[PDB]
């Protein structure tokens, strides 16, 4: 869904690479899927990668999301 893409955009804008964190958050993905989405988002959206680089949102979502299902 597009909401998952929005959440992944927020996650990549918050911190750097967090492949293990988002892999453990969603127990249906793998390293290949997140690597693939990083590859296809690094090229097609030049403004979004720079915006994530210059934004650096605080991690106010991953710490709370790590406890709801684990």
């Amino acid at each position: 869904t597009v909401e998952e893409m929005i959440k992944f955009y927020k996650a990549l804008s918050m911190w750097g690479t967090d492949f293990n964190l988002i892999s453990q958050l969603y127990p249906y993905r793998s390293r290949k899927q997140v690597k693939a989405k990083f590859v296809n988002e690094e090229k097609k959206r030049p403004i979004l990668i720079e915006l994530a680089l210059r934004s650096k949102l605080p991690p106010n979502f991953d710490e709370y999301c790590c406890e709801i299902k684990k």
């Binding site: 293990n20 964190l21 453990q24 991690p59 710490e63």
Partner: protein, 289 residues
């Protein structure tokens, strides 16, 4: 002795090769050529660490290919889980190692004479197979089939022969032995429909099929223009050593990369504990091993 150790290994190779050949249904001289290729492989310091079925499958395939036959790698890999493409990769590795010469051609005319009996059989077995090979012979010279999985083009030609002739058969039942995706199958069928005027499709195709030029392969259409539209001189060839000399490798050249990188090489130390919290939360037992 040195000669004594060879015999047990050759006996094991013969036993495994005969065991696979008992399910592959190949003649005796093909197995003999495969065993002599296995002897050549052992003479070339046979690849260790490989699975036994891989090397015997490669030798069986090269023996069955040195004389024009019909066997396909899926038949080699038809025991419930074999991962056929690994066998293909091992064969590709053994191409250079064994240094194959006098390479055999890749023509799908012999494929149809073996695919005919299983799917889309005929009462006389003369009509559909000859129609398929006759259309394939002229579709090959149009430079359309080039490195495009000969089993797939054989199945597509069989489907075209069934379409032009009369045969009440299921379209999707052919994937039992052909093992071809429906997407590329219908791509090749409507490619044949595009490249043919369909002048007499309902009765019988044209008996004088000549297409001198006038056609291009689909990959040429995709990436000849390298975009989407909807004998040079040696002086013109510069050496790239000057490109490497342009960047200075001086020990004092540590401040030539100041393009805001110097403020952001690494993570800030104020969030090190914040990272460490979720690190010991998750990435903790991942290091103790």
């Amino acid at each position: 002795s040195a000669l004594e150790s060879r015999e047990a290994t050759l006996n094991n190779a013969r036993r495994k090769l005969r065991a696979v050949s008992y399910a592959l249904h190949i003649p005796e001289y093909i197995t003999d050529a495969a065993f002599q290729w296995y002897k050549l492989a052992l003479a070339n310091n046979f690849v260790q660490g490989r699975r036994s079925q891989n090397v015997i499958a490669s030798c069986l395939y090269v023996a069955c290919r040195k004389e024009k036959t019909h066997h396909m790698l899926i038949d080699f890999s038809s025991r419930l889980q074999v991962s056929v493409y690994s066998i293909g990769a091992t064969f590709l590795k053994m191409v250079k190692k064994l240094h194959i010469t006098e390479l055999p051609l890749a023509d799908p005319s012999l494929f149809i004479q073996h695919f005919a009996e299983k799917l889309d059989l005929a009462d006389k077995k003369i009509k559909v197979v000859k129609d398929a090979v006759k259309l394939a012979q002229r579709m090959s010279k149009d430079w359309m089939f080039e490195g495009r999985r000969p089993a797939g083009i054989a199945g597509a030609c069989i489907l075209l022969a069934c379409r032009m002739n009369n045969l009440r058969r299921t379209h999707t039942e052919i994937v039992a032995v052909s093992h071809v995706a429906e997407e590329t199958l219908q791509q090749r069928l409507n490619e044949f429909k595009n490249t043919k005027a369909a002048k007499l499709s309902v009765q019988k195709f044209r008996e004088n099929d000549v297409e001198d030029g006038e056609a291009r392969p689909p990959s040429f259409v995709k990436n000849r223009k390298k975009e989407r539209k909807i004998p040079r001189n040696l002086h013109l060839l510069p050496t790239t050593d000057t490109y490497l000399s342009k960047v200075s490798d001086d020990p004092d050249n540590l401040e030539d990369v100041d393009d805001e990188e110097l403020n952001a090489h690494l993570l800030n130390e104020e969030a090190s504990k914040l990272k460490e919290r979720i690190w010991i939360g998750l990435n903790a037992d991942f290091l103790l091993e």
